[PDB]
């Protein structure tokens, strides 16, 4: 699925996501512009092996299980596949433990990239939340 701005907006919301460790909804709502454009089919394979993985790029070597990452954790105890679906609702809750592990959203690199520091609450402008 790709979503519309305001869709994910709402979608995020209904799910806890705004405020969520302190990080105001528009945080999250341009993060996974940066990521994914929207899609939650999005992929992307890292040099390391591992691959990142739906709207919001959430990676292998820590966080899910997709079978082909040696090494690696699956913190969130969900199959890789979970964080591809229409439905955000496992991207959501394993993006709630990774933002709860000490660094925030640092932990994802195009946040501090691209969002950190800007007026990230235009991400959510216009929107009905
Ligand atoms: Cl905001
Ligand atoms: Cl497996
Ligand atoms: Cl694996
Ligand atoms: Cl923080
Ligand atoms: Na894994």
Same mark, same amino acid.
């Given at each position: 699925?790709?979503?519309?701005?305001?869709?994910?907006?709402?979608?995020?919301?209904?799910?806890?996501?705004?405020?969520?460790?302190?990080? !105001?909804?528009? $945080?999250?709502?341009?993060?996974?512009?940066?990521?994914? $454009?929207?899609?939650?089919?999005?992929?992307?394979?890292?040099?390391?092996? %591992?691959?990142?993985?739906? #709207?919001?790029?959430?990676? %292998?070597?820590?966080?899910?299980?997709?079978?082909?990452?040696?090494?690696?954790?699956?913190?969130?105890?969900?199959?890789? !596949?979970?964080?591809? %679906?229409?439905?955000?609702?496992?991207?959501?809750?394993?993006?709630?433990? #990774?933002? %709860?592990?000490?660094?925030?959203?640092?932990?994802?690199?195009?946040?501090?990239?691209?969002?950190?520091?800007?007026?990230?609450?235009?991400?959510?402008?216009?929107?009905?939340?």
């Amino acid at each position: 699925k790709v979503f519309g701005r305001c869709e994910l907006a709402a979608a995020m919301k209904r799910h806890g996501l705004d405020n969520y460790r302190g990080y !105001s909804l528009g $945080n999250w709502v341009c993060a996974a512009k940066f990521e994914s $454009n929207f899609n939650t089919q999005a992929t992307n394979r890292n040099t390391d092996g %591992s691959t990142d993985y739906g #709207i919001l790029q959430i990676n %292998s070597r820590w966080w899910c299980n997709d079978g082909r990452t040696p090494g690696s954790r699956n913190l969130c105890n969900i199959p890789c !596949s979970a964080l591809l %679906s229409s439905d955000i609702t496992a991207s959501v809750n394993c993006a709630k433990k #990774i933002v %709860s592990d000490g660094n925030g959203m640092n932990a994802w690199v195009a946040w501090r990239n691209r969002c950190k520091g800007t007026d990230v609450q235009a991400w959510i402008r216009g929107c009905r939340l």
